[model samples]
Target: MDHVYKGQLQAYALQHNLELPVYANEREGPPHAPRFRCNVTFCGQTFQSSEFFPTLKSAEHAAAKIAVASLTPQSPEGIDVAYKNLLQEIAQKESSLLPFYATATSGPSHAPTFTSTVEFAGKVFSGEEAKTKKLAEMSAAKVAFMSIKNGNS
Candidate 1:
């Protein structure tokens, strides 16, 4: 069951045509054997695959099965690839996501919101406090966009 399923799982991944670039660190690999390691990655999460086998045969089998029976499969497996690629693209692109950052001043429950400032076109745009950091950024983003469309900020 060990080598059988995990091997199948790994085999499955190769066949799984991906739509985006993915970032993954082999928990361990190259000397693809029982003693090395295999990473069971799927959907959004990567499992360390599983336990170890002293030799090439046992390790490969156990690790492979572990990969298959994850928290059954969120299918983030594919999404993970796309997400990583997107982030990489954003990072490398001339325009950066590096400028946007969130700040929080917390209070009681439901008492505080978040603020985010996004820089675009050399302009500093700030968002109002919102329930979530994402919302705050959106608020700021809207302002920045509108500011540009309308006039100078």
Candidate 2:
């Protein structure tokens, strides 16, 4: 993948409150293999989606959708693309507030684990901390929306 596009996607994810898991770097595999086959634990569930696209846009769309669906409820609400889009919009609005990578890498192709560390507010967050932070941001965004609607009534 192009480094620029990867950077953009990473930034987009962070801006949109996508919880990125700690990838295990010790793993190894083909450098060009898809990175989506691994099981990622987020929001109390393990989600598995690989980067099946030859282009960055496709990968990004999948990533965005994954991020959105991950935060939504597991029933009828979970299927709402509108909610996902709203989350994406909020993430775009807050893009500048997102973090920069301290370190991140998708392990070798054979390995199902990827690891990344992000520098946010002068601190590094990794593993479960990163996951929790992402979930918290999403929750806060949802609450903010609810608060606005309630106040308008």
Candidate 3:
């Protein structure tokens, strides 16, 4: 992820057929102590970098890369698909839950906002109520998988 974007990572997970759930930890460190923490589920093992990033986004990128390197070196397809595939795997698995979405806001003549939720090996990831179910689902998938990707640059 530190290399590519998280959305791309989603695609990688999907193409590779890996579960790859991402989890994060936030620490309060007297303001700007790189309080963000990130981890990944790979090879039935959990990895959290010994160092912390300045921001959650950066931390996630590093963590995702660490996982991807240890798990998939060639990446088969790439980082983009990994994240998507991760969500797709969760969706495909019998034990896992299907994506969930519902409208959160509405207006008279304007399009309404919708939020979608997708749960996996980690927390329940979601997106702001957008406009369409497809969009929201896509958004949810993007959000859930946004925790990882290839830093192979």
Candidate 4:
């Protein structure tokens, strides 16, 4: 999954008959921990990775991952979509909207983590730390989905 973002973005472009530029901007950091930053431009808006990644492709994928979400609907075709669909199903059953939010750790800019939570069914479900907000949100939704499923069985 870590490397899927690049392909996802390319797939999206192919679906829409658009060619996009997906690459990193610059590399900076100490010799021990080289950092790369990437930007993904789509629909006249540029999306960037939240932080520098250890690898060029990782940063590029992170930016592409974020861009793909903005260009399309929430029905992202990643592994997390299963959890997302489950959460959506339960939210519809409860007649509520799935309200999910995330906050990044207040740590150094070089490395930041996000914690996501989804509020629904009178409870808030939280997920583990993730490098990107979407991943964190998916993780939170998965937590909510499992809990809801457990309640039923």
> Which candidate comes out best when scored by TM-score?
4
When 2 and 3 are scored with TM-score, the better candidate is 3
> What does candidate 4's lDDT look like per residue over 1-153, in tens digits?
365787787777787888665564788888998988777777667788566778877777778878766766765465544566666776787898876554656556887777877777668888878678777776777787677768744
Summarize candidate 3's per-residue lDDT along 11-77 as a digit string, tens digits.
7778878775655567657654547776665546667889877777787778777766664555455
Worst 10 residues of 3 by lDDT: 144-153
Each model's TM-score, in the order given? 0.31, 0.22, 0.39, 0.42
Compose the digit string of candidate 1's lDDT tens values, residues 1-153: 344654466566667853222223233434555345444445655555445545554554554445565635764355333333433344457465544444756767757756677654455777777678656766775676566558754
Name the best candidate (by lDDT): 4
Q: Judge candidate 4 at residue 144 and give its lDDT.
A: 72
RMSD of each: 15.2, 22.5, 14.2, 15.1
Off by over 4 Å in 4: 1-3, 74-153
lDDT of 2 by residue, 1-153 (tens): 233433544564587686653221122336775333333344345443543554444444454456545444543443243343454454467563354433333545665333445433344444322334444344444554454356744
Q: How many steric overlaps are in each model, in order?
A: 13, 7, 23, 0
Error of 4 at 136 (Å): 31
TM-score quality measure for candidate 3:
0.39
* Candidates by lDDT, descending order: 4, 3, 1, 2
